[PDB]
């Protein structure tokens, strides 16, 4: 059913630029830089 629906429409021939991962495949790695968590990078205030 998906083969007929993929063969029916004319696509962009799927160039390497058209390659995309499935949703939730790779995590958007968190970077400590920002005003989200200030200056402590999630380590809290002082302490060891």
């Amino acid at each position: 059913x998906x083969x007929x629906x993929x063969x029916x429409x004319x696509x962009x021939x799927v160039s390497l630029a058209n390659l995309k991962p499935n949703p939730g495949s790779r995590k958007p790695e968190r970077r400590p830089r920002g005003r989200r968590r200030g200056r402590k990078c999630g380590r809290g205030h002082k302490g060891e």
């Binding site: 059913x1 998906x2 083969x3 993929x6 063969x7 696509x11 021939x13 799927v14 160039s15 390497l16 390659l19 995309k20 991962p21 499935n22 495949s25």
Partner: protein
Amino acid sequence: XXXXXXXXXXXXXXXXXXXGLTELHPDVFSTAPRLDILHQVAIWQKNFKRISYAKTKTRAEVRGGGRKPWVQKGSGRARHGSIRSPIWRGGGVAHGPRGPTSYYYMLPMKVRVQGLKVALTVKLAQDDLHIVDSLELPTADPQYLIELARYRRWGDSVLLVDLEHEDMPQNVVAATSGLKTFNLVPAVGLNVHSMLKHQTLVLTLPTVAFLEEKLXXXXXXXXX
């Protein structure tokens, strides 16, 4: 059981002939092509080719000495250690690439195999895949190949997989000489990277034979 029937057009490649008939049964075809697998295979193929030659020098690897530039207190200046410190403009970086590594990894056989299979399915159903009985290049000149690609209205980029690499000089000589459009590669050297690199695929009968043999044996080994 659904049997896919693909028409193989035999071209004598001289000129003005699109006429040929052979009945092919590519059981290798898949219903829905996996984009995720293809992407992972491409990323991996890009990954193991990395040289990882990026280098730097941590403060310990700096030629500079570890002597204290001045007294800790009373100097009026800021507290400072060796001048090779990253806080100094004469120092390096701590988190830098200097420590080497290997960006490659071991990908399961079924994944890469299903990758090549799915890619082949993509090229198949995209009409960009054509099957021939043989290949002939009697004149062996660039002009002939160009005018052939223009007259027969082939794709902008065509990957030719025909030879077993052990024969047929007349073709290879002209095909491997100064041609950006067409690319050459043996039937046993066929890979997914080469297929995804080009917008059009052209295979011959022995090539399709060995390919379907390898892919049916790998699919049968993965199913069992």
